[PDB]
């Protein structure tokens, strides 16, 4: 049978994600009772909810069967779940398809492979070591401002958001004065279904509102990035904007400018927001588990373990969607050609078949098998940058902290997509 309606709504609807407790209880109910079922929520396409760690790997390692963008019918699948009204809006705007960005999530092989190779080497761990000292100087400046502002603050909007944004804008060559605009458009981009993040220029109550907001935000990013692409093509610099802007195909022709725009939208949004969420989530967990803060201050080599467990618990990127290009049997179910799948990374990260006491915050999982970056050819390109920035910031910050207390109500972004904390009121005790 279909998944029961309120479990299905809890996971599919953005409102279902407002509060982590009921959301994670819905993922757990599925993993234990209906690990591979079809959600049939009014206003959405039917979705196979991929809740199990092994099933996430099985789907993601088979891109010839489970496409992101629809295969040769490019743009026939939206890799980021919109409602039906929203996909209809986008098909009206684009003329029959859903490929609203030329960013990696929308691409299938071999196009995905050619485009990804423009930046694959830049993002490898050995090629990121050259940025470690700049990252550390940015962390130290951020910590100097935290110490100067006193013990009481929102650890998200008054601390965690700024460091990853500065790091990524510095690695582009985007001037510091443009950070507020990039932050505002990122809130519009990941807030399409959040009641406190609605743009003024869209009909907020329309059935397609989130899709209108997505499109409006992309158009603003395009206007900003068209100037940066033209600037770096005319005057190349030693920065990531130039690598993207001047990229040429195998025939010596620039990739179309929208491909550079796609890289820029992804790096200007996911490039900072996910790291901010994970840092804020880590601080929240150190407040719940003060013994972990004591241990990591005692042994700074535990910092990468703390990062890995923060990534598993926070898992801020909640899903991408796939479409079956042929019928496929998995876990005793018959997925049909054309059926859509929702990859629930947060649920894979609580799978008791893989993680002992999966809801516990345990930095001593070695190895820490989390799937917070996904899997397969679409696996997060930024993962090594995120792990470096989180390591560097914790190495600099934790010596300055004796204790984190949460002093007010945490708030999450209401999204089924790229979520995590927007507010974490704290009282810090400095060492």
Ligand X SMILES: Cc1ccc(Br)cc1
Long-range CB pairs of 85-92, under 8 A, 24+ apart, other chains included? 85/43, 85/206, 85/207, 85/208, 85/211, 86/207, 86/208, 86/210, 86/211, 86/212, 86/214, 87/211, 88/208, 89/208, 89/211, 89/212, 89/215, 90/211, 90/214, 90/215
Which of 85, 114, 216, 266 is in the footprint of ligand X by CB under 6 A? 266
CB distance 41 to 13 below 8 Å? yes
**Does 375 show up as a binding residue in the annotation?**
yes
For residue 346, give the nearest of 286, 393, 415 by alpha carbon: 415
237 annotated ligand binder: no
**Nearest to ligand X of 209, 317 (CB atom):** 317
Residue 199 or 319: the one with the smaller Cβ distance to ligand HEM is 319
Interaction partner, residue 418 (ligand X, ligand HEM, none; CB < 5-8 Å by kind):
ligand X
Nearest to 281 by CA among 14, 23, 20: 20
Q: Does 274 bind ligand HEM (CB under 6 A)?
A: yes
Report the alpha-carbon distance of residue 373 to residue 67 in Å, rounded: 18
Among 50, 68, 101, 302, binds ligand X (CB under 6 A): 101
Q: Is 378 in the site for ligand HEM (CB under 6 A)?
A: yes
Q: How far apart are CA 90 and CA 68, in angstroms?
A: 17
Part in contact with ligand HEM (CB under 6 A); list of ranges 1-9, 12-20, 332-340, 372-380: 372-380
x/- site string to ligand X, residues 335 to 374, per CB under 6 A?
A: ----------------------------------------
Query: What is the distance between the alpha carbons of residues 260 and 179, in angstroms, rounded to a whole number?
Result: 19
136 marked among binding-site residues: no
| Strand order from edge to edge, sheet including 66-67 | 36-39, 47-50, 340-343, 321-324, 66-67
Q: Could you tell me which of 396, 385, 391, 18 has the C-alpha nearest to residue 172?
A: 385
Annotated ligand binding at 380? The verdict is yes
Q: Which does 101 bind (CB under 5 to 8 A by kind): ligand HEM, ligand X, none?
A: ligand X
Exactly one of 26, 267, 296, 335 binds ligand HEM (CB under 6 A); that residue is: 267
Q: Is 40 among the annotated ligand-binding positions?
A: no
Out of ligand X, ligand HEM, none, which partner does residue 46 contact, by CB within 5 to 8 A per kind? none
Q: Is 286 in the site for ligand HEM (CB under 6 A)?
A: no
Verify binding: residue 385, ligand HEM, rule CB under 6 A. yes
Identity of the residue, 146 or 218, whose beta carbon is nearer to ligand X in the bound complex: 218
Interface with ligand X, residue 103, by CB under 6 A: yes
Sheet holding 152-154, edge to edge: 152-154, 425-430, 401-406
Interaction of residue 100 with ligand HEM, rule CB under 6 A? no
Q: Which is nearer to ligand X, 107 or 393 (CB)?
A: 107
Candidate segments 99-107, 120-128, 146-154, 210-218, binder of ligand X by CB under 6 A: 99-107
Q: Contacting ligand HEM (CB under 6 A), which of 63, 316, 410, 419?
A: 316
Q: How far is the CB of 315 from ligand HEM (least distance, A)?
A: 7
C-alpha to C-alpha distance for 275 and 335, rounded to whole angstroms: 34
CA dist 317 and 418 (Å) reads: 5
Which residues within the stretch 341-370 sit at the binding site for ligand HEM (CB under 6 A)? 345
CA distance linking residue 30 with residue 157, whole number of Å: 34
CB of 109 to ligand HEM, least distance (A): 10
Residue 257 φ/ψ, nearest 5 degrees: -60, -30
Angle at 260 between CA 259 and CA 263, to 5 degrees: 90
Q: With binding defined as CB under 6 A, does residue 53 bind ligand HEM? A: no
Is residue 317 within the footprint of ligand X (CB under 6 A)? Answer: yes
- Give which of ligand HEM, ligand X, none residue 316 binds (C-beta under 5 to 8 Å, depending on kind): ligand HEM
Query: Which of 378, 383, 386 lies closest to 116 in space, CA to CA?
Result: 378
Number of residues that bind ligand HEM (CB under 6 A): 29
Site string for ligand HEM, 103-132 (x = CB under 6 A): -xx----------x----------------
How far is residue 44's CA from residue 340's CA, in Å, rounded to a whole number?
Answer: 11
We find the least distance from the C-beta atom of residue 286 to ligand HEM, in angstroms, to be 17
Shortest reach from residue 341's CB to ligand HEM, in Å: 11
Strand 328-330 with 333-335, pairing: antiparallel
3-state secondary structure of 82: coil
Q: Give the DSSP letter string of 191-260.
A: -TT-TTS--TTS-TTSTTHHHHHHHHHHHHHHHHHHHHHHHHHHS--SSHHHHHHT-B-TTSPBPPHHHH
Annotated binding site for heme b: 112, 322, 375, 378, 380
Binding site for ligand X (CB under 6 A): 101, 103, 105, 265-266, 269-270, 317, 418
List residues binding ligand HEM (CB under 6 A): 60, 104-105, 116, 168, 266-267, 270-271, 274-275, 278, 311, 316-317, 320, 345, 372-376, 378-382, 385-386
């Amino acid at each position: 049978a279909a998944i029961p309606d309120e479990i299905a709504r809890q996971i599919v609807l953005p409102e279902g994600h407002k509060d982590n407790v009921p959301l994670f209880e819905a993922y757990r109910w599925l993993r234990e009772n209906q690990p591979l079922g079809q959600a049939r929520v009014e206003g959405y396409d039917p979705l196979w909810l991929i809740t199990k760690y092994a099933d996430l790997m099985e789907v993601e390692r088979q891109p010839q069967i489970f496409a992101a963008g629809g295969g040769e019918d490019k743009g026939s699948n939206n890799p980021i779940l919109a409602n039906q009204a929203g996909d209809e809006f986008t098909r009206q705007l684009l003329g029959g398809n859903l490929r609203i960005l030329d960013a990696l999530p929308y691409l299938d092989q071999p196009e995905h492979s050619v485009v990804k190779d423009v930046a694959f080497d830049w993002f490898r761990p050995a090629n990121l070591k050259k940025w470690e000292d700049r990252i550390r100087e940015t962390a130290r400046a951020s910590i100097d401002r935290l110490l100067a502002g006193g013990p009481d603050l929102d650890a998200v909007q008054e601390f965690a958001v700024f460091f990853p944004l500065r790091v990524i804008m510095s690695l582009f060559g985007v001037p510091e004065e443009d950070e507020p605009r990039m932050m505002a458009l990122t809130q519009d981009f990941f807030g399409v279904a959040d009641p406190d993040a609605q743009r003024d220029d869209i009909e907020a109550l329309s059935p397609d509102a989130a899709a209108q907001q997505w499109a409006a935000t992309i158009a603003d990013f395009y206007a900003y990035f068209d100037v940066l692409v033209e600037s770096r093509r005319a005057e190349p610099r030693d920065d990531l904007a130039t690598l993207i802007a001047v990229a040429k195909d195998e025939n010596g022709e620039y990739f179309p400018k929208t491909f550079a725009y796609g890289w820029f939208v992804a790096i200007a949004t996911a490039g900072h927001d996910t790291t901010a969420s994970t840092l804020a989530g880590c601080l929240q967990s150190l407040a719940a588990h003060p013994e972990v803060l004591d241990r990591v201050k005692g042994d700074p080599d535990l910092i990468p373990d703390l990062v890995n467990e923060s990534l598993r618990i926070v898992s801020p990127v909640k899903h991408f969607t796939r479409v079956a290009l042929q019928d496929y049997e998995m876990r005793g179910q018959k997925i049909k050609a054309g059926d859509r799948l929702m990859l629930l990374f947060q649920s894979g990260n609580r799978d008791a078949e893989v993680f002992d006491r999966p809801d516990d915050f345990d930095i001593d999982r070695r190895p820490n098998k989390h799937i917070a970056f996904g899997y397969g050819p679409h696996m997060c390109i930024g993962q090594h940058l995120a792990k470096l920035e989180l390591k560097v910031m914790l190495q600099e910050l934790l010596p300055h902290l004796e204790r984190v207390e949460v002093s007010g109500e945490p708030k999450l972004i209401q999204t089924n997509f790229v979520g995590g904390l927007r507010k974490l009121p704290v009282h810090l005790t400095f060492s």
